[PDB]
């Protein structure tokens, strides 16, 4: 919800350490942008399928 206390709430959480994705990255090269067929930058709602494969 991005609460009034989000700053204290979020800083309390240690940075999540995810594993590499399980289905791989779906791309041949990570270091272009998502739009360019790589993995980086804002991929919007697609951050979930990635993060889920890394969690």
């Amino acid at each position: 919800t991005v609460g009034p206390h989000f700053k204290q709430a979020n800083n309390f959480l240690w940075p999540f350490k995810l594993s590499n994705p399980s289905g791989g990255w779906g791309v041949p090269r990570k270091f272009k942008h998502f739009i360019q067929g790589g993995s980086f930058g804002n991929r919007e709602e697609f951050i979930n399928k990635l993060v889920k494969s890394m969690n």
Binding site: V2, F6, K7, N10, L13, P15, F16, K17, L18, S19, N20, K30, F31, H33, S39, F40, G41, N42, I47, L50, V51, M54
Partner: protein
């Protein structure tokens, strides 16, 4: 839809050969290690941060 106020960032890039300015932003966002994610609330003042680190 009201544009998203909450974003989750995971560092995709390894530790080395990173220019200084993106490299500090990475630290201040607590992504100092590969595949380590955090939550970031979206405002202009963190939006510019996400801009600096997009390739990593």
């Amino acid at each position: 839809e009201a544009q998203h106020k909450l974003v989750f960032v995971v560092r995709i890039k390894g530790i080395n050969k990173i220019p200084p300015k993106p490299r500090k932003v990475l630290q201040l966002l607590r992504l100092t290690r590969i595949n380590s994610g955090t939550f970031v609330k979206v405002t202009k003042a963190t939006l510019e941060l996400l801009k600096l680190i997009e390739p990593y």
